[PDB]
Every structure is written in C-alpha cells, then in structure tokens.
Amino acid sequence: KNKCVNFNFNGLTGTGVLTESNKKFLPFQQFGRDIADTTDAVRDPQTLEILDITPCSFGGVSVITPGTNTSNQVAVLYQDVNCTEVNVFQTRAGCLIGAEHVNNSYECDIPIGAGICASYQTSQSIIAYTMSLGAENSVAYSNNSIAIPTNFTISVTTEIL
Amino acid sequence: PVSMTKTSVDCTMYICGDSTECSNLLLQYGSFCTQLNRALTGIAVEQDKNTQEVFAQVKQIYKTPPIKDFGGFNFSQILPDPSKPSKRSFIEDLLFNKVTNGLTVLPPLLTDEMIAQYTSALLAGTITSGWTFGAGAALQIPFAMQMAYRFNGIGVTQNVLYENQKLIANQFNSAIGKIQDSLSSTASALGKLQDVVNQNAQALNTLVKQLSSNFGAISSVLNDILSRLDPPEAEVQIDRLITGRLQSLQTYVTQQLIRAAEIRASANLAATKMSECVLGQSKRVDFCGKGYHLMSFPQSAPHGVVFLHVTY
Amino acid sequence: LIANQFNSAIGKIQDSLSSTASALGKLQDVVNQNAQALNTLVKQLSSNFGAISSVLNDILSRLDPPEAEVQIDRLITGRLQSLQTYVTQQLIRAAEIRASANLAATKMSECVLGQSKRVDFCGKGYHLMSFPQSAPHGVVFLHVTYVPAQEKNFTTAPAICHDGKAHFPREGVFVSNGTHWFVTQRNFYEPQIITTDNTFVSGNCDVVIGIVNNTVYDPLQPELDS
Ligand SMILES: *[C@@H]1O[C@H](CO)[C@@H](O[C@@H]2O[C@H](CO)[C@@H](O)[C@H](O)[C@H]2NC(C)=O)[C@H](O)[C@H]1NC(C)=O
Ligand SMILES: *[C@@H]1O[C@H](CO)[C@@H](O[C@@H]2O[C@H](CO)[C@@H](O)[C@H](O)[C@H]2NC(C)=O)[C@H](O)[C@H]1NC(C)=O
Ligand SMILES: *[C@@H]1O[C@H](CO)[C@@H](O[C@@H]2O[C@H](CO)[C@@H](O)[C@H](O)[C@H]2NC(C)=O)[C@H](O)[C@H]1NC(C)=O
Ligand SMILES: *[C@@H]1O[C@H](CO)[C@@H](O[C@@H]2O[C@H](CO)[C@@H](O)[C@H](O)[C@H]2NC(C)=O)[C@H](O)[C@H]1NC(C)=O
Ligand SMILES: *[C@@H]1O[C@H](CO)[C@@H](O[C@@H]2O[C@H](CO)[C@@H](O)[C@H](O)[C@H]2NC(C)=O)[C@H](O)[C@H]1NC(C)=O
Ligand SMILES: *[C@@H]1O[C@H](CO)[C@@H](O[C@@H]2O[C@H](CO)[C@@H](O)[C@H](O)[C@H]2NC(C)=O)[C@H](O)[C@H]1NC(C)=O
Ligand SMILES: *[C@@H]1O[C@H](CO)[C@@H](O)[C@H](O)[C@H]1NC(C)=O
Ligand SMILES: *[C@@H]1O[C@H](CO)[C@@H](O)[C@H](O)[C@H]1NC(C)=O
Ligand SMILES: *[C@@H]1O[C@H](CO)[C@@H](O)[C@H](O)[C@H]1NC(C)=O
Ligand SMILES: *[C@@H]1O[C@H](CO)[C@@H](O)[C@H](O)[C@H]1NC(C)=O
Ligand SMILES: *[C@@H]1O[C@H](CO)[C@@H](O)[C@H](O)[C@H]1NC(C)=O
Numbered sequence: 001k002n003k004c005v006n007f008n009f010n011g012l013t014g015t016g017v018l019t020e021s022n023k024k025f026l027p028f029q030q031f032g033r034d035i036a037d038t039t040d041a042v043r044d045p046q047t048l049e050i051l052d053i054t055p056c057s058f059g060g061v062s063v064i065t066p067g068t069n070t071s072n073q074v075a076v077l078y079q080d081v082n083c084t085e086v087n088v089f090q091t092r093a094g095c096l097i098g099a100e101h102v103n104n105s106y107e108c109d110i111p112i113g114a115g116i117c118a119s120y121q122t123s124q125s126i127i128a129y130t131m132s133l134g135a136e137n138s139v140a141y142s143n144n145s146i147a148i149p150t151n152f153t154i155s156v157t158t159e160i161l
Numbered sequence: 162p163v164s165m166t167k168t169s170v171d172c173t174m175y176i177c178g179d180s181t182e183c184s185n186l187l188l189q190y191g192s193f194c195t196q197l198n199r200a201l202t203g204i205a206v207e208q209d210k211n212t213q214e215v216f217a218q219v220k221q222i223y224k225t226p227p228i229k230d231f232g233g234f235n236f237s238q239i240l241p242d243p244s245k246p247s248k249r250s251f252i253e254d255l256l257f258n259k260v261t262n263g264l265t266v267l268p269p270l271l272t273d274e275m276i277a278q279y280t281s282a283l284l285a286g287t288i289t290s291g292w293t294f295g296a297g298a299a300l301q302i303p304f305a306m307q308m309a310y311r312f313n314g315i316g317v318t319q320n321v322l323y324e325n326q327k328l329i330a331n332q333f334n335s336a337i338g339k340i341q342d343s344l345s346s347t348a349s350a351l352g353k354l355q356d357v358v359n360q361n362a363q364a365l366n367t368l369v370k371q372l373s374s375n376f377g378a379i380s381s382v383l384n385d386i387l388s389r390l391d392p393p394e395a396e397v398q399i400d401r402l403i404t405g406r407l408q409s410l411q412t413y414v415t416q417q418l419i420r421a422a423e424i425r426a427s428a429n430l431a432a433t434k435m436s437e438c439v440l441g442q443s444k445r446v447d448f449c450g451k452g453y454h455l456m457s458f459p460q461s462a463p464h465g466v467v468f469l470h471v472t473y
Numbered sequence: 474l475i476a477n478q479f480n481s482a483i484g485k486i487q488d489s490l491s492s493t494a495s496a497l498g499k500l501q502d503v504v505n506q507n508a509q510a511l512n513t514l515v516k517q518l519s520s521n522f523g524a525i526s527s528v529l530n531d532i533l534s535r536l537d538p539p540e541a542e543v544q545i546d547r548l549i550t551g552r553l554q555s556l557q558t559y560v561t562q563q564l565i566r567a568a569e570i571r572a573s574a575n576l577a578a579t580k581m582s583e584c585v586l587g588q589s590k591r592v593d594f595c596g597k598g599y600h601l602m603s604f605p606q607s608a609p610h611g612v613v614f615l616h617v618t619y620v621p622a623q624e625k626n627f628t629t630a631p632a633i634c635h636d637g638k639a640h641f642p643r644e645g646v647f648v649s650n651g652t653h654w655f656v657t658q659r660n661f662y663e664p665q666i667i668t669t670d671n672t673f674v675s676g677n678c679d680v681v682i683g684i685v686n687n688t689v690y691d692p693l694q695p696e697l698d699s
Contacts, residue, residue, distance in 0.1 A: 006179075013384045015179045036369035038262070050575045059265060060169070082263055090647050092268050111209070113268045115275055133278055137221040137297050141289040143230055143683060146629040146646065147300035150662040151620030153477055156482035157596040158489070161577040180610070190512050190551070191520035199509075201477060218593070232682070296598055297620045304685065306631055306646065315506075320641055320675035326682055337540055411558065418565050424574075431595075441592035 004056035011041050014053065018042075054092045057085045059094060064110055066120040075099040077112065087109040091116050091127055096128055105132035162357050162465045163428045165214050165421060168204035168365070174263035174458035175372075176406045182384050182392070182398050186317035193407060197414050198254050199279040206419045209270045215466060216271070216279040218435055223285040223299060232305035233330030238337050239458055239469070241281050249277045249461070255344045259351050260358070260371055276461040283439055283459055295440030308455070314442050315473055316454040333471065340469065354465045360420060368413050376405030378426065416433075431466050435459060438468065479617065486615065500611045506566060514559045522551030525629040577612050583604060584614060599660075625662065630654075630685040632678075633667070639681050640672040640689055647685075666690055 006015050012031060023041050030033060032041030032050075041052050065071075075098035078086060083095040090096075092114030099118055105140035108131040109119040117131040140147075172194040177183030187194070220281055225240060241248045247255070257273070286294035291307040293300040305326060309319035322329065339361050346352060378401040379390070386398045438449040438457040452472030460467040490496060506636040515531040519525045524547040525535075531545045584595040595603055596616025606613045632639045645658045647667070655664035656671045665671060668690050678684050 013382075016645045036262075036366055037373045038369065055262075058174070060171075079267070081189075108270075111270045113270055115270070115272050117270075133217075133275060134220065134222045134282075135223065137299070138224050138226065139285070139289040139301050140626070141226055141228075141301050142512055143232070143303050144628055144630065146306070146627055146648065147298075147624045147659065148301045148627060148646075148648065148659065148662045149300070149624045151621070151623035152661065153622045154478040154601070155596070155598050155618045155620045156479070156484060157598075157616045157618065158486060158496065159580070159596065159616060160497055160608070161573055161580070161612055161614070186523070189523050191517050191519050191522075191555075193558075196513055201561075224534055292592070293621075297622075298624055300621075300624055303629065303631070303683065306629065307629065318641075318675070319631075320639070323681045324642075415561060418562075422565065422568060436593040437591050444590070450681055 001051075010045050011161045012039065014039065014040075016053040016055050018051045021050040023050050023052070025050050057081050062097065064096075064112070064118050065128065066110075066126075071120060071124065072119075073098075073124075073126060075118065075128075076119060088127075091128075099128040102127045102129045105130050107132055162353055162424055163215050163431055164208040164269065164464045165204070165357065166361050167197070167269060168361070168417070169201050169205065169210055169267055170197070170410065171263035171265075171369075172407075172410055175368075175410060176403055177383070178262070178385070182387055182395065183383055183403065186396060186399055188401055188404050190403070190407065193411075197410055200414050200418060204228075204417055205267050207421055207425060211425060212269065212271055212276070214432045215428055215435060216276055216283075218432070218440065219279065219282050219286060219294065221294075221299070222278060222282045222403070223284045223289065224281065225288065231288065232303065232308075233327060234304055235330075235334045235337070236284070236458075238341060239284060239460060241277065247274055247277060248281065249273070250466075252341065252344065252460050253277065253280070253462070254340070256351065256460060259344065259348045260354055260463040262372065262471075264365065264369070271462065280459050280461050283435070287439055287456060287458065292441045311442055311455045313456070314444075317453075317473065326410065336471075337469075346359060351462070354463060357424070357464060364413055364416055364420075368409060371406065371409040373404060374402050375397050378402050378405075434468060435466070438470065482617075483615075497608065500608060503570070503610060510562055512558055514555060517552065517555040520551060521547075523547045529669075566635060580614060582613070585615065621660065632681050632684045633687045633689070634678040634684060634690040635687075637677050638674050639676050639678050639684060640667070640669075640674055642672055645671070654685075668692060 001018050001020065002061065004015065004017055007013070008019065021041055025041075025043055030043050030045075031039055034040045036104055039053060043049055043050055049105065059081045060077075062077040062079065063077040064077060075096060077094055079094040081094050083087050083090050086095055086097070088095065089099060089101045091112065093112050093116065096112065096116075096118075106117075106119065106129055107113050108117035111117050112128065114132050116128055118126060118128045129160065173184065173187065177187055202341065212434075220290075229236070238251045241250055245254070286299055288304065289301055290299035291302055291310065293302075305323065308329070309322050312319055312322050348355075373381050378386070378398040380386055380398075381402075383399065383402065386395050386402075434449070434457070436446065437443045438454070439459055443449045443454050444454065449468075450470030450472045455471045455473055457471065458469040460469065494501075524532070526532055526544075527548075529545065529548065532541050532548075536544065559612040580603075583589045583591065584600065585605055586620050588602060589595045589600050589683070590686060594600075595614075596618045598618025598620040601617045601619055603617065604615045606615065627650060629649070630647045632641050633647060633654065634640075642656050645656050647656050648664065649655070653699060656667050657664045667687065670692065672689065
C-alpha cells in the first residue's frame with residue numbers, strides 16, 4: 001500500500017497508489033468507477049476491504065532562467081506536485097528548486113503562478129517572491145478639500161498594433 | 162467573462178499511458194504532440210493577459226480613509242469588508258457563492274485577493290478623485306462636487322444635484338440594496354460565467370470519455386491488446402486507438418482555441434468598459450447601462466467582472 | 474514650453490525605439506508564430522506515419538503498386554491531416570489579426586483624424602492628438618496627451634451665499650487658499666475674482682449642503698456710480 005505500483009486485479013490492470021478507502025461497495029461490486037468511466041477504487045479479491053486508486057504523482061517540468069546573455073544559472077519548477085516526491089520552495093504551482101524565497105515584494109518579471117513570480121537579482125542569484133501590485137497610496141479625501149493642477153506636461157506614448 | 166481555466170495536457174500520457182509499444186508507434190506521427198501542447202500554452206498565457214488587461218488599469222493601490230462621509234452616499238456594500246478573511250465586499254462574496262490521464266490545471270497568475278485589491282483601488286479612486294486617477298495623479302474632491310461634474314456631463318445643471326442631494330443619495334442606496342436582493346435570490350444572473358465553466362468541464366469529460374472508445378479496434382484497453390495479441394496484430398489495433406485519441410485531442414484543442422477567442426473578445430470589451438466607464442464618464446449610448454451615464458463601480462467574480470452602472 | 478515638451482518627448486521616443494527592440498514584440502510575435510506554423514508543416518514531411526519510409530520516390534522505387542498504394546495511403550493521410558491542422562490554425566490566427574486591424578482602423582479614425590474623448594483609447598492622459606507611423610505588418614501611433622503634473626491643495630465649496638441667494642460656478646469650481654475665495658477652471662489653476670459673470674444663481678442657502686459665505690463682486694455697480 002501507499003506506493004506507486006503496477007497492479008493487476010481479477011480482470012484489470014493499471015498503475016497507481018493503493019490506499020485504504022472509506023467507500024462502501026455492495027457485496028457484489030468489485031471495482032469502482034468515477035464520473036468519466038475511470039477506475040477509482042477496487043475490492044481485493046482475497047481480502048474484502050476496499051482500496052482507493054490514486055494516479056502516480058506526475059506533472060510538467062519547467063525551467064526558469066534569465067537570458068543566457070546574463071547568466072547560465074537557472075531554477076526548476078515541478079508543477080502541481082509535492083517537493084517530497086522529488087533552497088526549496090513549495091507553492092500552489094508546485095515545487096521550486098534553485099530560487100531563494102524572499103519576503104520583499106517586487107513587480108513581476110518571470111511569472112510562476114498563484115501570485116509568485118521570480119527574477120535574477122543581487123552575489124547575484126534567482127529569487128522568488130509574491131509580486132507587488134503597486135505602491136500603496138491613500139488620497140487625502142475630505143468634504144471640503146480639492147487638489148487642482150497648477151501645471152502640466154505633454155506626454156507622447158507609443159501604441160503598436 | 163474575462164478568463165478561462167488554464168488547462169494543459171500531456172498528449173503522450175493521454176494517448177499512450179504507461180506503454181512503450183504505443184509510444185514508439187506515436188513517434189511516427191511527428192510533432193502533433195508538441196503543437197497541441199504549444200496551443201494550450203498559448204491559451205493559458207492569453208488568459209493571464211486578459212485578466213491583467215482588465216483589472217491592472219491603475220498605477221497605484223488607492224485606499225479609502227476610515228471615514229465614510231460621502232455626502233450621504235453609502236458604499237459599504239461594495240467596499241471591502243476588512244473583517245472577512247479575503248479583502249472582498251458583500252457583493253463580491255455573493256458573486257463568488259453564486260458560481261460552481263495527463264490532464265493538469267494551471268493556477269492563475271493573480272489570485273482572488275489580488276483581483277479584490279485591484280477592484281478596491283479602482284473603487285477608492287473613483288470615489289475620492291473621480292476620473293483624475295485615470296489621467297494621472299489622483300486629485301481629491303468631495304463626492305457631491307464629483308456628482309455635480311457628472312451631472313454637467315449629461316446636460317443637467319449642478320444646482321439640481323445640490324438641491325436634490327438627499328434624494329439622490331437615497332435612490333442610490335436603495336438601488337444598491339436592490340442589487341443585493343437580485344443577486345441573492347436568482348443565480349441565473351451569472352449565467353454568462355457559469356456557462357463558461359460548464360463548457361470547459363464538458364470539453365474535459367468528453368475528452369476523458371473518448372479514452373473508453375475502441376475506434377474500430379478490438380478493445381479500448383492498451384494492455385489487453387498488448388497482452389493478448391502478438392506485436393504484428395497489436396500494432397494495427399494500437400494504430401487505430403492512437404488515430405482516434407489524437408483526433409480527439411485535436412478536436413479538444415480546436416474547440417478550446419475558438420472558445421479562447423470568444424473569451425478574449427469579452428475581456429477586451431471588459432477592459433474598454435473599465436476605462437471608458439469606471440475611469441471616466443462615457444457619452445456612448447447604452448455602453449454603460451440604459452440611461453444617461455453617471456459612473457460605474459467594478460466588482461470581481463469567478464473568471465469575470467461585474468459593473469454596477471449608475472445612470473440618470 | 475509646450476513645444477519644447479513635445480519635441481523632448483519625440484526625442485525620448487527615438488531613444489526608446491533605438492535602445493530596445495522588445496517594444497515591437499506584438500509584431501515580432503506574429504512573424505514567429507507563422508514561421509513555426511511553416512517549419513512544423515515542413516517537418517511533417519520527414520515523418521513516416523506508419524509507412525516504411527518518409528520518402529515517396531523510395532517507395533515507388535522499391536514496391537509494386539499493390540503495396541506502394543498502402544504505404545502512400547499512410548503518407549497521404551498523415552500529410553493531409555498536417556495540412557488541415559496548419560490551415561485551421563492559420564484561420565484562427567487570421568481572425569485574431571483582423572480584430573487587431575479593425576481596432577487599428579478605429580484608432581486612425583477616432584484618434585488621428587479627430588480628438589477622442591474616450592479614456593485610455595488614445596494613450597494615458599487627456600488626448601490632444603496622434604500621429605501614425607508605418608511598420609512591417611503593422612502600424613504605430615504616437616499619442617500626444619496632456620497630463621496634469623503639479624497639484625495644490627485648496628479648501629473648496631459647492632456654492633456661496635451673497636444675499637441669501639446661492640451662486641454656483643458656470644465653468645469651474647470655487648476654491649480658497651485659507652483667506653480669500655476664487656473661482657477657477659478645474660484642469661488648471663487660473664484663479665479669478667468671483668462675479669456674476671463667472672456664476673449663476675439658483676435658489677437660496679437653506680438647501681445646499683457645504684455652502685459657505687463670501688462676497689460676489691458685481692462689475693456693473695462701480696460703472697454706474699462712476
Ligand atoms: C481468502 O484467504 C485470505 C487470506 O487471508 C483471507 O482473507 C480474508 O477475507 C475475508 C473476506 O474476503 C475477510 O473477512 C478476512 O478479514 C480476511 N482475512 C485476512 C486475515 O486477510 C480469507 O481467509 C479468504 N477470503 C475469502 C474470499 O474467503
Ligand atoms: C450603509 O448601509 C449599511 C447597510 O448594510 C450599513 O452598514 C453597516 O454599518 C453598521 C454600523 O453602522 C455595521 O455594524 C455593519 O457591519 C454595516 N453593514 C455592512 C454589511 O456593511 C450602514 O447603515 C451604512 N454604512 C455606512 C458606511 O454609511
Ligand atoms: C421624483 O420622483 C421620486 C421617486 O424616485 C420622488 O421621491 C420620493 O419622494 C417620496 C415622497 O415625496 C418618498 O416617499 C420616496 O422615498 C422618494 N423616492 C425615493 C425612491 O427615494 C419625488 O417625490 C419626485 N419628485 C416630484 C417632483 O414629485
Ligand atoms: C511645469 O512643469 C514643466 C515640466 O517639469 C516645467 O518645464 C521644465 O522646466 C525645467 C526647469 O524649470 C526645464 O529644465 C525644462 O526644460 C522644462 N521642460 C521642458 C522639456 O520644456 C515647468 O517649469 C513647470 N512650470 C512651473 C509652473 O513650475
Ligand atoms: C490667497 O490668494 C490671494 C492671491 O490673490 C490673496 O488674496 C489677497 O489678499 C491680499 C491681502 O489682503 C489683498 O490685498 C488682495 O486683494 C487679495 N487678492 C485677491 C484678488 O483676492 C491671499 O493673500 C492668499 N492667501 C495666502 C495665505 O497666501
Ligand atoms: C453664513 O452666514 C450666515 C449669517 O450669519 C450664517 O447663518 C447663521 O447660522 C447660525 C448657525 O450656523 C445660526 O445660529 C444663525 O441664526 C444664522 N444667522 C442668520 C441670521 O441666518 C451661516 O451659518 C453662514 N454659513 C456658512 C457657510 O458658514
Ligand atoms: C547582451 O546584453 C548586453 C547588455 O545590454 C547587450 O549590449 C548585448 O547586445 C547583448 N548580447 C546579445 C547576445 O544580445
Ligand atoms: C507535502 O508533503 C508534506 C510532508 O511529506 C505533507 O505534510 C503535506 O501534506 C504535503 N502537501 C501536499 C500539497 O500534499
Ligand atoms: C520572512 O519572515 C518570516 C517571519 O518572521 C521569517 O521567519 C523568515 O525568515 C523571513 N524570510 C526571509 C526570506 O527573510
Ligand atoms: C495635500 O495635503 C495632504 C496632507 O494630508 C498631502 O497628503 C498631499 O500630498 C497634499 N497635496 C498637495 C501635493 O498639494
Ligand atoms: C465635514 O466633515 C466633518 C467631519 O467629518 C463634519 O464635522 C462637517 O460637518 C462636514 N461638513 C459638511 C460639508 O457637512
């Protein structure tokens with residue numbers, strides 16, 4: 001139990017993790033099914049206890065890197081997995097390796113997910129951080145105060161389409 | 162609607178789960194696997210971009226003062242409730258509550274709280290400064306005088322507002338209450354959003370279901386073919402299965418591309434509305450609700466946004 | 474001052490475009506996509522799709538029709554599928570580009586040929602004008618806008634009381650630096666003396682909220698007694 005194995009029951013085969021279940025099969029029911037006609041549980045033919053089948057942990061492997069022109073130092077993201085199956089940082093996206101966790105918040109350079117971005121900064125190394133939405137501000141609102149411009153500027157912005 | 166679910170799929174694992182005999186055959190088909198993955202990646206990036214374009218329209222994170230002396234107008238039902246775990250308003254909570262093999266779901270780059278922060282910033286700016294915070298620096302102004310400007314902007318003199326300030330405020334508050342009531346009882350209001358979800362769900366279930374099919378082969382299970390027939394016969398049946406599953410993946414990806422185009426159109430519209438309507442006062446008819454536009458207030462929602470258009 | 478600011482901005486544009494290329498990503502991206510869609514296509518010729526070879530003449534030079542037919546059927550199926558994929562992707566991408574182009578045309582109309590009061594449609598600020606510049610497979614708008622820069626605090630009031638009556642500003646707002654009241658246009662501090670030429674009357678002071686007291690100068694009275 002509790003390991004990724006290649007299982008073969010009475011008439012069926014698969015690869016997964018067998019765990020003690022809480023389901024309630026009927027005396028004649030042998031293998032359970034999901035919504036998508038997917039096998040999720042079985043009954044061991046010898047011992048009548050029910051086992052949940054969880055697919056073996058898997059997911060994308062992505063590389064976080066600044067331009068090679070800058071550095072050859074990188075980080076690795078294992079998506080939607082736990083660091084257990086593999087300077088380590090667990091996130092809603094997965095396990096991040098090679099990047100330092102930092103409390104300081106900056107504007108996003110290389111997005112990762114769930115509000116986590118990364119960048120290459122000063123000695124120099126890759127860092128991951130919760131991204132900053134912007135500089136916090138409070139406006140001096142009062143029922144008898146108004147701010148009026150005494151001056152101006154002429155801005156020229158480029159829009160490419 | 163603004164964004165979709167950032168789904169991704171491992172074509173190899175979907176077609177040839179834990180099978181080498183199958184994978185070696187699949188290599189014969191070339192780059193089909195890669196281009197499908199590429200398309201889906203594009204879609205996910207587009208979703209993040211949509212959300213950014215819509216909400217991240219403001220330079221700074223403005224916040225309201227503790228005092229709520231807005232000339233009688235009440236915004237408690239749209240401003241953030243600091244007591245609640247998320248920094249979300251009453252109405253935002255209502256909206257969030259009125260919505261419900263090689264496949265993976267990528268999480269969005271911005272979380273519900275960041276979206277809520279953006280909405281709070283926009284709301285505070287619209288309240289304290291009017292439209293000046295879209296042009297540039299937020300310039301404080303009393304709310305009543307802001308509404309006087311908004312009245313002059315629709316060909317109504319400003320004395321009307323001051324002389325009828327209490328009535329206007331009461332009407333506004335009552336309308337907000339009505340919004341609460343409307344959203345609380347009937348869920349159908351958020352169909353546009355729910356629909357989206359359903360579609361994707363369907364498109365996934367269907368996909369998964371297409372594994373249970375034989376596509377003219379002797380069986381649906383790969384291992385059964387491998388273990389029962391010898392290679393020369395097995396290869397043909399596996400070719401049949403691979404053709405079917407690859408076709409299924411292509412269909413899914415194409416439908417997702419089209420759906421993404423639709424969502425991107427919606428998101429561009431939403432961004433245009435947040436600009437011309439929230440950050441300003443639009444004279445485009447029926448672009449900001451049926452009536453003479455005064456202002457609009459945003460509220461986040463699952464994979465989408467909601468505008469409250471205040472009109473005269 | 475305005476002319477100098479404008480010219481300096483144009484210089485900054487030159488510098489920005491000369492330094493970094495990333496600015497034109499929107500264009501480059503497009504190119505890249507198409508390139509990929511072609512390379513991929515070409516690559517799909519080198520595949521077998523279950524056949525004995527990825528070449529056609531080799532099959533023709535090895536097998537008789539009875540079997541070359543089968544192999545060629547395999548190749549044809551594969552290549553036709555590849556072409557269909559390419560064409561579908563291209564159709565979708567073309568829809569995307571057409572949307573972009575329609576937007577660009579709308580901008581050239583509402584922004585260059587005119588002065589739009591749509592916000593952020595024609596650059597961050599109050600739109601003054603825009604100038605087009607071509608580019609490979611696209612267009613580039615230089616949006617000239619007016620951005621207020623230096624701002625000052627003032628006490629304000631929605632109206633005032635002169636003789637029990639209420640005076641509202643015709644074009645602008647009432648302000649006070651602490652001692653004296655003025656009326657000025659909202660978008661630029663140009664304080665003026667409060668008169669009947671700058672204001673209009675409506676009702677009295679027992680209705681308006683936040684109303685204040687001050688004297689409205691009537692230009693006519695001095696002219697008479699003079
Ligand atoms: C078959 O032999 C197995 C090997 O012990 C036994 O398994 C039992 O299964 C029954 C019901 O299937 C359970 O009530 C028992 O708890 C199991 N015992 C143990 C110790 O595993 C059992 O003797 C035989 N099972 C059957 C099908 O009769
Ligand atoms: C606006 O109307 C709302 C009705 O919801 C009221 O806001 C409540 O204010 C009381 C104290 O006055 C608080 O105990 C409640 O938590 C508030 N309710 C909510 C859900 O916001 C109040 O009558 C008015 N508030 C303002 C700011 O004007
Ligand atoms: C203008 O119409 C409004 C309806 O919105 C009237 O305002 C109401 O006034 C009555 C009593 O006069 C109150 O009972 C209501 O609470 C007000 N309505 C709302 C929704 O606030 C107003 O009386 C009308 N004015 C004229 C010119 O008759
Ligand atoms: C209004 O703001 C503008 C922009 O800062 C000021 O114009 C600049 O003035 C400085 C020094 O006075 C010069 O170095 C620049 O050459 C000017 N800008 C350009 C490019 O023309 C202007 O001085 C400000 N006016 C006020 C009222 O302070
Ligand atoms: C507020 O602005 C005006 C600048 O015009 C100042 O008001 C002047 O006050 C002086 C001193 O009594 C008078 O002689 C002028 O007639 C006033 N000007 C006008 C046209 O009203 C006032 O001093 C400023 N206040 C401060 C604190 O600087
Ligand atoms: C403008 O001046 C008038 C005249 O003094 C003020 O009216 C007085 O208001 C106070 C309380 O605010 C009352 O006790 C008096 O009876 C009122 N006087 C008269 C004769 O009307 C008014 O408050 C002032 N308004 C402002 C903006 O300060
Ligand atoms: C590497 O970066 C430097 C610094 O900007 C730049 O001058 C140079 O052109 C870059 N080289 C490449 C490979 O683009
Ligand atoms: C990751 O593993 C740790 C320890 O092995 C465990 O406590 C935690 O529940 C796991 N987290 C997830 C995401 O399953
Ligand atoms: C972040 O702050 C927490 C809370 O004090 C602390 O334990 C941790 O060391 C800090 N991490 C970094 C990167 O400094
Ligand atoms: C106005 O005074 C307030 C004090 O609360 C300050 O925050 C603000 O910057 C001032 N505005 C200007 C620049 O006049
Ligand atoms: C402005 O606010 C203060 C405190 O909130 C209050 O004492 C005063 O009555 C208000 N003035 C107006 C315009 O009612």
